[PDB]
């Protein structure tokens, strides 16, 4: 698959801040959602919060204590998010291309995909 | 509570009476409780399935 | 209609001895019914001694 163009992405960093993104298939549209699930072997795995198509409710969290995500732009149509702090372990592949799933929900159980794929083998765990 | 068993007996029902207790998370803690394929909690109100 | 089936009632004290009575009354709402099965013929319960 072609890989989406995208402003920083990959394994997390301990404090701060990181606006993860990746880029969408439509343009100047921002009526989509976004997955940003990992898949990787084991255990070393972490819930990751979802944005719905609507966009009015946003991440597992809600509206009430999250903050609006940013998903339109001019140059290139992106989805921006903000990450909470986490773990800096981690071993699963990244890779930011087209998305396996477009029906984008408020789901739990749901995930990105079942099994992996191509992606760099970055890890920091083993 | 009452009158239900697991997804080989799960118990069926619909009437226009009321809704489940379910939605008290719905006002101010409206958690991921509310599992949504494809569509948000918020298109429920607007229209249904 | 649309699968939906309506109930409607109502309740008036009289004194006959044959025949239906004068007069006008609504018949109040009851239930809605969303089986949608189809329907083609009915038959009335009566208690028997």
């Known amino acids: 698959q072609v890989q989406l163009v995208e402003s920083g992405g990959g394994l997390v960093q301990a404090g701060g801040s990181l606006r993860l993104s990746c880029a969408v298939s439509?343009?100047?549209?921002?009526?989509?959602?976004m997955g940003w699930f990992r898949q990787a072997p084991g255990k070393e795995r972490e819930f990751v919060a979802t944005?719905?198509?609507?966009?009015?409710?946003?991440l597992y969290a809600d509206s009430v204590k999250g903050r609006f995500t940013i998903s339109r732009d001019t140059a290139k149509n992106m989805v921006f998010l903000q990450m909470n702090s986490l773990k800096i372990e981690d071993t699963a592949l990244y890779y930011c291309?087209?998305?396996?799933?477009?029906?984008?929900?408020?789901?739990?159980?749901?995930?990105?995909?079942?099994?992996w794929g191509q992606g760099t083998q970055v890890t920091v765990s083993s | 509570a009452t009158r239900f068993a697991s997804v080989y007996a799960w118990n069926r029902k619909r009437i226009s009476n009321c809704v489940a207790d379910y939605s008290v998370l719905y006002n101010s803690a409206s958690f991921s409780t509310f599992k949504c394929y494809g569509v948000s909690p918020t298109k429920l109100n607007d229209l249904c399935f | 209609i649309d699968g939906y089936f309506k109930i409607y009632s109502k309740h008036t004290p009289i004194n006959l001895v044959r025949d239906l009575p004068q007069g006008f009354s609504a018949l109040e709402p009851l239930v809605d019914l969303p089986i949608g099965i189809n329907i083609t013929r009915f038959q009335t319960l009566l208690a028997l001694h």
């Open positions: 291309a087209v998305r396996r799933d477009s029906s984008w929900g408020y789901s739990r159980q749901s995930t990105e995909y079942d099994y």
């Open positions: 439509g343009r100047t549209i921002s009526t989509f959602g």
């Open positions: 944005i719905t198509r609507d966009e009015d409710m946003l």
